[PDB]
Design a protein around this ligand. Structure first.
Ligand SMILES: CCN(C)c1nc(Sc2ccc(F)cc2)c2[nH]cnc2n1
Ligand SMILES: [Mg+2]
Ligand SMILES: [Zn+2]
Length: 313
């Protein structure tokens, strides 16, 4: 318990910043996560032995897909860690615990295919979960792994707190279904401007955590441009495989998933930044002013994609 995880100097410092990249060294990612849990929650919130066992079963249940992999899990968790650490007093004890775990688990057993593709393929998950298909699966994998012998990191919580934390985690993971983001942000924006936003309203808190989850999930757009640009490669590698799989079902995929339409990527990124990314971090910055660096970094990347179109790169 006097066993404080410590990172090298450069990582100790830069891990505090929104734009931190967790690096190419897979074997340091558990240690980075534990460090963040200890700083964000306490060395007391989880039994080190159980927490490490939990982390290593979660890693095992992420697949070797170009984008929706273990590195994405730990990147999304780091973004949450920066939000939480910049908004210390805004969050309950149960929230701080649940949200880092939710972010680590949020794409558990992802196959590199959209909810759309599962439904058109007629995958059994699509029959089990009519909406937020993969997101209900991710939550289910999280509960399955928490129920493994020696893996219940929540063991010391009361029956009450345990149901509360698993309910935070469930809502947090469902919110990562981008189909639900658009409405969540509209409501949050309306609420904020008519001055009805009330962080004491549990239903309001839910919506604000939902947006956090979108912001953390989309955080590749808030990195330094060379990170942003190389991550886009990984994202499109998955989309274009999906597109291929659509063509095998006899379905012309949307252009974003068609590798024949690679040329249209820069214009595609503009729409995404304008319709999703920029509104997400704006509404977030309005609700949580210390998250302004995400909006700033996002705007910088919008500017790099504009330059790519102008053939300025
Ligand atoms: C509307 C195109 N689209 C959804 C999309 N998504 C992302 S992240 C992402 C991953 C999976 C999703 F189901 C949704 C979003 C992007 N990052 C850079 N360009 C992008 N375009
Ligand atoms: Mg997901
Ligand atoms: Zn994700």
């Amino acid at each position: 318990g006097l066993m404080q995880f410590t990172l090298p100097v450069r990582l100790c410092k830069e891990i505090e910043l929104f734009h931190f990249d967790i690096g190419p060294f897979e074997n340091m990612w558990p240690g980075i996560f534990v460090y963040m849990v200890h700083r964000s929650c306490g060395t007391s919130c989880f039994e080190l032995e159980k927490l490490c066992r939990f982390i290593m079963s979660v890693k095992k249940n992420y697949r070797r897909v170009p984008y929706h992999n273990w590195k994405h899990a730990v990147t999304v968790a780091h973004c949450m860690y920066a939000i939480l650490q910049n908004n210390h007093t805004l969050f309950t004890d149960l929230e701080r615990k649940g949200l880092l775990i939710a972010c680590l688990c949020h794409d558990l057993d992802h196959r590199g295919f959209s909810n759309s593709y599962l439904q058109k393929f007629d995958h059994p998950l699509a029959a089990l979960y009519s909406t937020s298909t993969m997101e209900q699966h991710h939550f289910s994998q999280t509960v399955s792994i928490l129920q493994l012998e020696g893996h219940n990191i929540f063991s010391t919580l009361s029956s009450s707190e345990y149901e509360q934390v698993l309910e935070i985690i469930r809502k947090a993971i469902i919110a990562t279904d981008l189909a639900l983001y658009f409405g969540n942000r509209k409501q949050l924006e309306e609420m904020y401007q008519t001055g009805s936003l009330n962080l004491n309203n549990q239903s309001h808190r839910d919506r604000v955590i939902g947006l956090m989850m979108t912001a953390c999930d989309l955080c590749s757009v808030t990195k330094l441009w060379p990170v942003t640009k190389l991550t886009a490669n990984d994202i499109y590698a998955e989309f274009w495989a999906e597109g291929d799989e659509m063509k095998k079902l006899g379905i012309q995929p949307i252009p974003m998933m068609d590798r024949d339409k690679k040329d249209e990527v820069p214009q595609g990124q503009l729409g995404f930044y304008n319709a999703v990314a920029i509104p997400c971090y704006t509404t977030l910055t309005q609700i949580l002013p210390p998250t302004e660096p995400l909006l700033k970094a996002c705007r910088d990347n919008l500017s790099q994609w504009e330059k790519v179109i102008r053939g300025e790169e």
